[PDB]
Amino acid sequence: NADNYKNVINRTGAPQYMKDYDYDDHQRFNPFFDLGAWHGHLLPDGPNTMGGFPGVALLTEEYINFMASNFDRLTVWQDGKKVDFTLEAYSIPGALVQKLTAKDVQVEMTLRFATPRTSLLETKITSNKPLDLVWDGELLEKLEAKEGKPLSDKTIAGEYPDYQRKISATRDGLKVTFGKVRATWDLLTSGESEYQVHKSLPVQTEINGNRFTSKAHINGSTTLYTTYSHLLTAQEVSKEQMQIRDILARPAFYLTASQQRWEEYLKKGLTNPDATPEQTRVAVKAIETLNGNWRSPGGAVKFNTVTPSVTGRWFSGNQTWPWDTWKQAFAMAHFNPDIAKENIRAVFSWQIQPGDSVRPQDVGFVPDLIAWNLSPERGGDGGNWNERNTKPSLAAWSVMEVYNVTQDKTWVAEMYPKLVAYHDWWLRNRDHNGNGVPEYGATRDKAHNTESGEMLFTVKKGDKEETQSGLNNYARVVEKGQYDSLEIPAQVAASWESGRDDAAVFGFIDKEQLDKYVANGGKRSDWTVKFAENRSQDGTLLGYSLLQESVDQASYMYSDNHYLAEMATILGKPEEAKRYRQLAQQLADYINTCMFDPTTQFYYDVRIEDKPLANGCAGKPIVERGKGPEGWSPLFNGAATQANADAVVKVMLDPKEFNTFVPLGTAALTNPAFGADIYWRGRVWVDQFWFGLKGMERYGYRDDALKLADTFFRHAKGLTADGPIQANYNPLTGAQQGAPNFSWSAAHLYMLYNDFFRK
Numbered sequence: 001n002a003d004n005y006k007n008v009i010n011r012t013g014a015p016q017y018m019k020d021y022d023y024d025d026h027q028r029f030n031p032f033f034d035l036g037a038w039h040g041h042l043l044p045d046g047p048n049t050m051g052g053f054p055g056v057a058l059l060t061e062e063y064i065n066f067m068a069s070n071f072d073r074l075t076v077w078q079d080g081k082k083v084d085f086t087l088e089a090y091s092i093p094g095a096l097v098q099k100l101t102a103k104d105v106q107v108e109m110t111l112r113f114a115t116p117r118t119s120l121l122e123t124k125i126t127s128n129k130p131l132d133l134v135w136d137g138e139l140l141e142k143l144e145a146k147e148g149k150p151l152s153d154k155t156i157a158g159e160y161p162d163y164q165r166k167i168s169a170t171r172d173g174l175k176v177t178f179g180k181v182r183a184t185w186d187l188l189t190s191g192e193s194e195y196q197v198h199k200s201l202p203v204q205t206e207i208n209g210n211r212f213t214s215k216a217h218i219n220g221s222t223t224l225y226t227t228y229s230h231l232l233t234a235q236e237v238s239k240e241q242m243q244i245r246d247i248l249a250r251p252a253f254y255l256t257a258s259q260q261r262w263e264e265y266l267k268k269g270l271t272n273p274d275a276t277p278e279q280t281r282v283a284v285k286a287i288e289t290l291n292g293n294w295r296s297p298g299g300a301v302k303f304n305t306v307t308p309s310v311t312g313r314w315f316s317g318n319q320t321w322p323w324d325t326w327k328q329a330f331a332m333a334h335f336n337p338d339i340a341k342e343n344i345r346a347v348f349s350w351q352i353q354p355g356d357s358v359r360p361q362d363v364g365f366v367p368d369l370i371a372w373n374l375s376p377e378r379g380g381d382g383g384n385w386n387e388r389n390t391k392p393s394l395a396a397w398s399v400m401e402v403y404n405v406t407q408d409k410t411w412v413a414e415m416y417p418k419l420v421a422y423h424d425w426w427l428r429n430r431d432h433n434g435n436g437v438p439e440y441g442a443t444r445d446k447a448h449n450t451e452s453g454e455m456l457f458t459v460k461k462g463d464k465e466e467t468q469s470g471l472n473n474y475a476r477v478v479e480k481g482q483y484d485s486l487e488i489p490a491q492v493a494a495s496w497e498s499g500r501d502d503a504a505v506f507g508f509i510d511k512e513q514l515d516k517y518v519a520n521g522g523k524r525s526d527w528t529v530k531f532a533e534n535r536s537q538d539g540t541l542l543g544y545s546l547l548q549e550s551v552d553q554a555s556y557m558y559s560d561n562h563y564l565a566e567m568a569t570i571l572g573k574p575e576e577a578k579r580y581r582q583l584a585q586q587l588a589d590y591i592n593t594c595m596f597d598p599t600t601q602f603y604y605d606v607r608i609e610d611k612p613l614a615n616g617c618a619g620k621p622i623v624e625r626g627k628g629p630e631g632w633s634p635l636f637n638g639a640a641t642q643a644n645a646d647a648v649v650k651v652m653l654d655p656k657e658f659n660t661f662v663p664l665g666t667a668a669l670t671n672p673a674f675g676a677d678i679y680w681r682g683r684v685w686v687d688q689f690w691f692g693l694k695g696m697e698r699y700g701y702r703d704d705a706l707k708l709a710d711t712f713f714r715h716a717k718g719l720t721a722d723g724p725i726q727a728n729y730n731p732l733t734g735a736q737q738g739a740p741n742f743s744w745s746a747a748h749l750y751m752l753y754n755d756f757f758r759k
């Protein structure tokens with residue numbers, strides 16, 4: 001019962017700025033979104049917003065922007081006397097509710113979504129005499145604030161002359177129209193987008209500048225219905241009209257559909273009823289968060305998808321990443337499998353095909369970031385779309401979890417060839433030495449290389465910067481060591497491809513940290529990163545590889561090969577199945593032979609050295625760059641031998657390494673490049689934490705895994721409060737950082753609730 005979980009997240013708020021930001025530039029309120037809609041609503045918090053759901057949040061293609069503080073706010077008059085209401089307002093999974101109570105009149109307002117563009121408000125009015133109803137609204141004027149403090153005197157219309165917002169009256173309500181604004185990082189409109197309000201009863205609407213007042217007279221107790229729709233193109237506007245009319249013709253049908261969908265999510269989702277009430281509430285928060293970050297098809301993305309955060313500065317609209325999706329879809333398989341499937345389809349829908357206009361050399365590649373607007377390179381004006389890199393291979397994992405739940409053979413038939421193409425791309429564009437063990441790297445790209453195919457890098461010395469090109473030049477510069485630091489777009493891209501931006505093992509270390517490392521006996525050269533171009537035999541530039549093979553991606557490709565074999569077997573392709581199982585074993589042998597270090601009892605990336613070692617390994621484990629969460633990836637993925645796993649778990653459980661106040665962070669305390677406030681060099685993310693506990697369980701250490709989960713539950717700050725879910729934690733203090741309403745945290749917190757959290 002959804003009524004059991006009121007106000008899991010604080011959804012109150014009265015925004016006064018289009019960009020009403022917190023310190024980290026995220027919208028500081030948490031609107032309710034559902035069904036993939038492109039608008040959301042907040043709850044009223046006092047007399048000034050009472051009677052309406054303030055802060056109409058609009059998703060303007062790739063960003064969240066507020067429209068109004070009050071919009072369609074109801075006030076009530078009985079024979080010239082204004083009714084004085086007291087307010088009760090709560091959220092539940094799937095709805096916002098507010099109740100206005102006065103002596104002789106009551107109003108109950110329930111707000112749910114009805115289509116992928118339309119929310120539905122029931123306004124149930126109890127009164128034994130006639131009443132005059134008044135709705136009012138005003139469009140926002142002020143542009144931007146941080147923590148309530150305006151940054152400037154700027155107005156929305158001043159910053160955006162072409163926005164040109166106008167309210168018009170219609171036969172059954174009103175609309176706001178918006179002009180075309182192509183503000184790459186802020187505000188993206190087509191010029192055809194509208195916000196429409198349709199009502200079940202006749203109203204008389206007056207318009208004064210950018211505000212309105214609508215009036216209606218009722219005879220007594222009645223229930224009316226209002227639809228709100230944010231429609232982003234002319235085609236959307238046309239198509240929604242018949243749906244709006246059906247909704248206002250059968251509102252009970254839409255309310256019930258939403259009620260029933262959410263009862264299902266909860267019945268399916270909450271499969272550990274012996275968790276404490278506080279633990280169950282965390283699960284429900286996760287479920288609301290994931291479903292709120294779900295977006296229906298829009299622009300270039302022709303499928304429903306789930307973004308990393310609807311309120312996030314850079315994660316909103318329908319901006320979609322691959323490994324976020326794999327994590328999201330794995331979790332969502334267990335309560336919203338329809339949208340899990342869609343999320344996966346969205347990512348693969350822009351997989352590179354033979355004859356691609358931009359990167360024909362990258363067949364099978366899956367873009368890092370897709371969104372409403374294509375990049376200029378593909379004829380759009382989007383600044384987010386990214387094809388510099390992909391993300392790690394967790395796709396088959398996600399796909400097979402969906403099949404295991406749904407048992408839909410059509411689904412495996414659908415995804416198998418895309419997954420195979422993705423696999424083949426890695427071994428063709430990310431395996432320089434041809435040993436079947438992939439490297440992270442970077443695509444041929446305007447950010448990475450000159451037009452002539454030469455790899456870019458910047459040498460820094462004091463205040464001097466010099467930007468150069470060419471791998472032979474790089475090799476020379478690196479050997480001489482005549483610089484303070486290097487910045488290499490390909491390096492950034494490669495770390496992005498791992499998903500662990502600026503991680504230690506990819507050669508990222510602050511200058512003070514690097515000096516300590518040398519003053520204690522280390523060679524500066526240990527932290528220098530080396531590259532190679534990957535070419536076909538006819539000389540075509542395919543991309544770049546780090547001269548380093550990563551133990552996380554090896555481990556993920558190992559599990560991915562097994563999942564592919566299962567899929568091949570399901571589809572009656574026994575020879576393809578056999579090949580994937582054989583490919584998986586070869587990688588297991590390599591991971592255990594090459595990437596395990598028996599001395600420090602841990603797994604690491606290895607270098608691709610000038611010649612391979614005697615045992616066929618490309619090089620030695622990069623033990624000197626320290627231990628990371630990639631080191632338990634062989635356990636999570638099942639590539640590890642029992643003995644190596646036994647070794648790894650001792651390290652994980654060591655307070656000197658990973659067993660911290662919030663355990664299992666992204667770099668061990670012993671890592672030379674550790675920092676408690678560095679996202680992927682110390683901070684604890686819930687995905688890597690969960691991969692760790694699952695890896696432990698798989699090799700017989702569930703008992704210890706349960707203890708870490710309990711430690712996490714007691715020490716991770718904010719967990720049992722009503723704030724939005726964030727991305728990561730200080731391993732020493734447990735303090736939260738990162739975008740609010742963060743999808744994969746929700747996904748892995750949900751999984752932790754199912755698998756590990758207990759009373």
Ligand SMILES: OC[C@H]1O[C@H](O)[C@H](O[C@H]2O[C@H](CO)[C@@H](O)[C@H](O)[C@H]2O)[C@@H](O)[C@H]1O
Binds near residue numbers: 323368495497499
């Ligand atoms: O613009 C490409 C770039 O975008 C993000 O900043 C990525 O960094 C984080 O965000 C995504 C989405 O949550 C995660 O998949 C990454 O693991 C995060 O580090 C960055 O890697 C690129 O994708």
Ligand SMILES: [Ca+2]
Binds near residue numbers: 430434439
């Ligand atoms: Ca290789």
Ligand SMILES: [Mg+2]
Binds near residue numbers: 375385386387388
């Ligand atoms: Mg680009």
Ligand SMILES: [Mg+2]
Binds near residue numbers: 501
């Ligand atoms: Mg980053």
Ligand SMILES: [Mg+2]
Binds near residue numbers: 566
């Ligand atoms: Mg199976």
Ligand SMILES: [Mg+2]
């Ligand atoms: Mg085996």
